[PDB]
Design a protein around this ligand. Structure first.
Ligand code: NF0
Ligand code: NF0
Ligand code: NF0
Ligand code: NF0
Ligand code: NF0
Ligand code: NF0
Lengths: 246, 246, 246, 246, 246, 246
């Protein structure tokens, strides 16, 4: 259910032009990050390259990797725009389209994941794994690039999120800080959770194993979910049990 | 119960001079970070600017902003001094006044919050939100700048701390790593906790909603607090219940 | 049960030469990080120096400190090699010896701890504490340098790990994201856990106090362990109780 | 008399692959500068961006500008290849096609001039003048972007070269360190020299005013040329007079 | 004959605002370098700090020093404004007040000299000599900070300019690239030239010893001046002799 | 005739300890550049690595190259100390042993040349040529690494110095800014000057061809020397003729 990419971009530029006027200390930042770019794809590649840069691998090098991915699969940029909207609609602290793009590390991590996922599915595993782990240090989100994640995702606050190799996260999911989608121990093969559409996961929840969390479900903060959660229910506790409906 | 600013500074400088002599590898660091500065405010702005610097906004620009805030509200520097003492008095590993200022990302994150809170209350929201989110990536602490936080606060270890827009933290509070002061929903308006004076919050505790944690209470590690906690009580478990007295 | 250092290194170079051919965008990274170095110690000091570098302390300065430590206690490099193997044998996502060394922040943090532990035991506490806290910001692991940690350790994902001053972690232990090995409150002296050989600690587990976790035990994700756990037992829940055996 | 671009590039990659094997310390440099790039244009934009980067304008931003220029006028890349050959054929110290491209600041400055000249002729004077003056600090060559400069040029050693706004330098010219192509004083309009094809200019020669230096002439080191020099003549002295023929 | 500081600044800001609109690629640069600053002094300190920054001493540290000098002697900022006008009025390529301030290393070197001269006259010689020599590597101009230099000075192109300890340069002087105001020996005491008001010095001129160059004189490019030059005379050649009148 | 290396080092450290006390703004710089190092070799490698660092090749990488050269030929460090003394004795503006080491780009260029010369004579031509050209951009001195240069050399001011492949510079030579020791045109084989012991070369002199400048001779500023200069004479003019004795 996402608004048009080109429409979110225009909104973003309009907000930024206006914001640059009312805060002179950030005008340079708004121009470099948003206003000089012709499209959302180019602003995204610039941002990720600058934020992921290190002595190990410079921004100029990261950018050409991201630009190649976006040139080959421009739907990733459309997913970014859907992710921007997800935050704006769901987070009461965020009114502007430009806010997630500019500032939120969960959003940034989610878009870096898309690049890593594109690389991994092309067999460019080394580069995907390089990026995954540079994202873990820079944005404190560790998503394996083989995980299958949809669009309209919000990674709220985001610090300490861990998502495993064989996880699936469907559209419109909201995930808070310190959520693990992980295994049951020294396990192998299909071993990580399947999070269905519209699920919200509270802070510090651990969802472990190849188990379903059904569509529209709510996972309580600090839960340890070891069995499947039916659609449209609230699961909570250690271990998690059904405590209501959302 | 907080001693004078000029006095902690003199102590800090005394410690640094002596430390520079016994560790030649750190002498340059002690001089740049502390000894060439004429006051704590100057040392704080330098440190925050250096640690928050990135490709997207340099140390030289961040320092200007911090210096402006400290010039307009120098009580923020007095709060920093109380925060240094808090760590020295409560953390048994730390015995020197210079230690929180030099090394501890919780202390730095708390002082960065103060600048953001000053900016936010001046209507300079873009800059406060920029700082909040750079603090999140740099020190792994995500405090909304509209949160109202007192002095004599310890953020022990600090990684993964998240504090919401409408939270309150009174004086002399101690918070550990991975503590969330968050919402219950999908919530709007006044929706985050009220942590009263002298409260201690254990590692990984989630305190959710507009609920009081009474003064002198102890929140257990890994707790999920969903109802108010009376003063001078120990609350623990998922969900939290009264388990005793400090 | 460790493969010899020199064999690990030879395999590392073999993998990297082959990987550099199949991914041109990372060839420079592989040559700088691995292929130009004559031994594992050289590569580790270069990597740690580059990854911990900041405005307050440059790579060139950090490298000198790490090289000194490795010259005085070369067994730290053998511990690194055991740690590489640990990840390779236990993590189904990792097949190559080069992977932990190149990418995993848990591995990097563990090797940085070794340098800090060496400095701390030489009485060079300032420098040990500088490194501890730079590792906290860069890799999001906070290990006090006085903690005693063996070899064959895996810090899986690693973000939010906190280990206290008087903790002990024996050989072949596996620790996940957001694990605290901490105290029970306003405590002093021997106050942190003793983790025995082959223990596995799930995501977000808090182990509090000077309590033992016995040989080969398994701590559940999200547990709050307040009493000792007997060997070869699975403990879980808030608070943790015995739920089975691995 | 220029070898084709694609043949130059193929030779460049061949040399670099071989050189990377025989010097491990530079393998990373060769892969980043040359071997990861699909064509000479890509390598030139990367090199210019990295070498001109500063706090005021990063590599990532400079690269976009250079890539745009090269996309709109790919003949600039063919001029670069002619310039590489010029140095290789004329400089007895240089045997490899890769050498000018990798190391020589005169070559780099010449290619930066081309980008500036392209911007200047598009009316993008601010950006042309930014580049001119960044080239002056980085490579110590100050060429006004309105100067008209051909191909097969060698700027040997290059430091202190100054070329004025209305200068012309035809094909196959060789210029040494500290050469000024300048005016006669407080002047205006067409006021700088016209250097014709195959001219050789010695170290420290000043050529002043809108005067011609004819085809195949030789200007002596330390000369002050104030009148025109006929073709195929050697001019030298202060002021310069005819002393022979090359 | 030098117009007001507040007026040149207002012009500079007017130019920058307009220029930012017609070149989106430089808008960030215009905002960081000029538009976010409240006065010329602030813009100058920022620029000098950014351009002189290096591994050995960061922008944030250099800015403090420059700000202290400008606070103690704000006439240095008025001299900068006269120097901007000098270039605008004398260099036919330059028509905007913002151009010398933004781009011209001769202008920057001259303003860095003023800070060094202030430091030197305060007995802070180490810092003046540090700055002199960082200016030499960054802007390729080497002025001893004890040299006495007036205002309305143009250092045109500027590369390789060298001015000695006991030199004097009065108001309204124009100096080109590779000009040396040096000694004759193996000399001691008062040993460098006295350049009087309105003198013009051509490219590569060497003026050696404690000799006068009289007011309004013109020194020819490539000259070696060893005896005094009377006012309003043109001196040229090796060695220099009187050749006419301006 | 050089003082002992170990004696100059002690002097250097004594000066620096004292200077760090009287200038707090530079204490960090004195500690990082001099006071933390155990010997002159280690301070030199640190300095050259920091000053030559770029996006292209980091300080950490440059340092290991310089350390290897110094470990294999420690006489290079003794030549450095002789060079420090040369400046102190010959330059009236320099009293302290620490001054050349800290600040003078000519001294730095001379020591980088020694590293390049060591590499070139080991057949490591690529790395020697990398360094030569990084020195040309950073210190504005371009010395071919095959040139044979003695000790007790002063490169005064140094900007624009160019020395060719087959040049020789004997002990105790003084060379000023913009001196070229170059060829006669498109020449080959032994083609650059032979500068004998104790020669001083004035600013902007061009000495061209395989010609001798005899011991103790003085070359005038701005001369063009095309024929041999007998020992103990002063040569000057364009072209140079014998004008006296020193
Ligand atoms: C024991 C019940 C714990 C309940 O946790 C939540 O209801 C909860 C709170 C939130 O802020 C969420 O975002 C969430 O998904 C669940
Ligand atoms: C299940 C009983 C709760 C256990 O957690 C604590 O007692 C606790 C609380 C705190 O605020 C701490 O700082 C702590 O170290 C332990
Ligand atoms: C019984 C409630 C939670 C149990 O959690 C686990 O079984 C667990 C423990 C571990 O050490 C793991 O690595 C894991 O993935 C799950
Ligand atoms: C007759 C006085 C100086 C002559 O200088 C040269 O012959 C000269 C000219 C050039 O173009 C060169 O490249 C050179 O090396 C010498
Ligand atoms: C040999 C006659 C001297 C030639 O040099 C100049 O006339 C000259 C002097 C200057 O001060 C200039 O700025 C210039 O462009 C030419
Ligand atoms: C025409 C005579 C020119 C004389 O140039 C010099 O005497 C001279 C001056 C200096 O400062 C030097 O260092 C030098 O070697 C020569």
């Amino acid at each position: 259910p996402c608004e048009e990419l080109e429409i979110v971009w225009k909104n973003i530029k309009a907000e930024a032009r206006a914001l640059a006027d009312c805060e002179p200390m950030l005008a340079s930042f708004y121009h470099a990050t948003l206003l000089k770019h012709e499209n959302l794809g180019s602003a995204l590649s610039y941002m990720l390259a600058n934020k992921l840069a290190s002595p190990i691998m410079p921004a100029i090098a990261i950018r050409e990797v991201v630009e190649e991915a976006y040139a080959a699969d421009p739907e990733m940029i459309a997913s970014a725009a859907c992710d921007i909207q997800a935050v704006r609609t769901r987070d009461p602290a965020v009114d502007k389209y430009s806010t997630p793009l500019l500032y939120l590390k969960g959003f940034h991590a989610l878009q870096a994941y898309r690049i890593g996922h594109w690389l991994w599915n092309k067999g460019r595993r080394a580069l995907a794994i390089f990026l995954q782990n540079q994202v873990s240090v820079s944005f404190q989100v560790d998503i394996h690039p083989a995980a299958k994640i949809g669009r309209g995702i919000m990674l709220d606050h985001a610090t300490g999120i861990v998502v495993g190799e064989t996880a699936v996260i469907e559209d419109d999911v909201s995930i808070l800080q310190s959520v693990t989608l992980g295994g049951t121990g020294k396990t192998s093969g299909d071993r990580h959770p399947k999070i269905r559409e519209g699920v919200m996961i509270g802070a510090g929840a651990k969802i472990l194993g190849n188990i379903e969390v059904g569509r529209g479900a709510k996972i309580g903060a600090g839960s340890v979910v070891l069995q499947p959660v039916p659609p449209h229910t609230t699961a909570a506790g250690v271990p998690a049990r059904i405590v209501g409906k959302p």
